Swiss-Prot record, chain A:
This is Target of rapamycin complex 1 subunit KOG1. The target of rapamycin complex 1 (TORC1) is composed of at least KOG1, LST8, TCO89 and either TOR1 (TORC1-A) or TOR2 (TORC1-B). Interacts with PIB2; following activation of PIB2 by glutamine or cysteine. TORC1 binds to and is inhibited by FKBP-rapamycin. Belongs to the WD repeat RAPTOR family. It is found in: Cell membrane; Vacuole membrane. It comes from the Eukaryota. The gene is KOG1. Coiled coil: none annotated. Component of TORC1, which regulates multiple cellular processes to control cell growth in response to environmental signals. Nutrient limitation and environmental stress signals cause inactivation of TORC1. Active TORC1 positively controls ribosome biogenesis via control of rRNA, ribosomal protein and tRNA gene expression, and rRNA processing. TORC1 positively controls protein biosynthesis by regulation of mRNA stability, translation initiation factor activity, and high-affinity amino acid permeases that serve to provide amino acids for use by the translation machinery.
From Swiss-Prot, chain B:
The gene is TOR2. The target of rapamycin complex 1 (TORC1) is composed of at least KOG1, LST8, TCO89 and either TOR1 (TORC1-A) or TOR2 (TORC1-B). TORC1 binds to and is inhibited by FKBP-rapamycin. Interacts with PIB2; following activation of PIB2 by glutamine. The target of rapamycin complex 2 (TORC2) is composed of at least AVO1, AVO2, BIT61, LST8, TOR2 and TSC11. TORC2 forms a homodimer. Contrary to TORC1, TORC2 does not bind to and is not sensitive to FKBP-rapamycin. Interacts with SLM1 and SLM2. It is found in: Cell membrane; Vacuole membrane. Belongs to the PI3/PI4-kinase family. This is Serine/threonine-protein kinase TOR2.
């Protein structure tokens, strides 16, 4: 309960968190676009790293929605 | 910016609510089509070189959607439009 006290620069901390989340979203979105661009290998990739690509994808969008929901809740 | 916003929020609300491709096309046609008339003011000059690239990149997703007819083809485009929003 001691840590629940508000503080002295709460708006400063809110802006700091906003910038951190915005930079994280930009980095994650750029990385997702890079992986999507690299996914066009012009091959079927059956029994290959294709399923690794979709599992990396599914690991990416989950963090994207987590970042979005925390940004909205902030 | 205001009519782009007014198209965008209505399209997002309709997509979240009822998921009808006809009304998606209806809500997405005007903003997509009005960007290729050429500039007439400094506001248009500032708008076309600052925001056109991301929207045209997301337009590839809908171009693929119109030939694939699968739901997952629009999630990345909707994320791009969410950043635009």
């Amino acid at each position: 309960l001691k840590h629940f006290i508000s503080g002295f620069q709460d708006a400063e901390v809110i802006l700091r968190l906003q910038q951190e989340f915005e930079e994280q979203y930009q980095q994650l979105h750029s990385q997702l676009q890079h992986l999507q661009n690299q996914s066009h290998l012009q091959q079927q990739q059956s029994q290959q790293q294709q399923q690794h690509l979709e599992q990396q994808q599914m690991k990416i969008e989950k963090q994207i929605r987590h970042c979005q929901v925390m940004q909205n809740q902030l | 910016h205001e009519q782009w916003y007014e198209g965008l929020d209505d399209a997002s609300r309709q997509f979240f609510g009822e998921h009808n491709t006809e009304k998606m096309f209806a809500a997405l046609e005007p903003l997509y089509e009005m960007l290729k008339r050429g500039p007439e003011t400094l506001r248009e000059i500032s708008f076309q070189n600052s925001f056109g690239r991301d929207l045209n990149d997301a337009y590839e997703w809908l171009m693929n959607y119109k030939k694939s007819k699968d739901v997952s083809n629009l999630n990345q485009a909707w994320d791009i439009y969410y950043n635009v929003f």
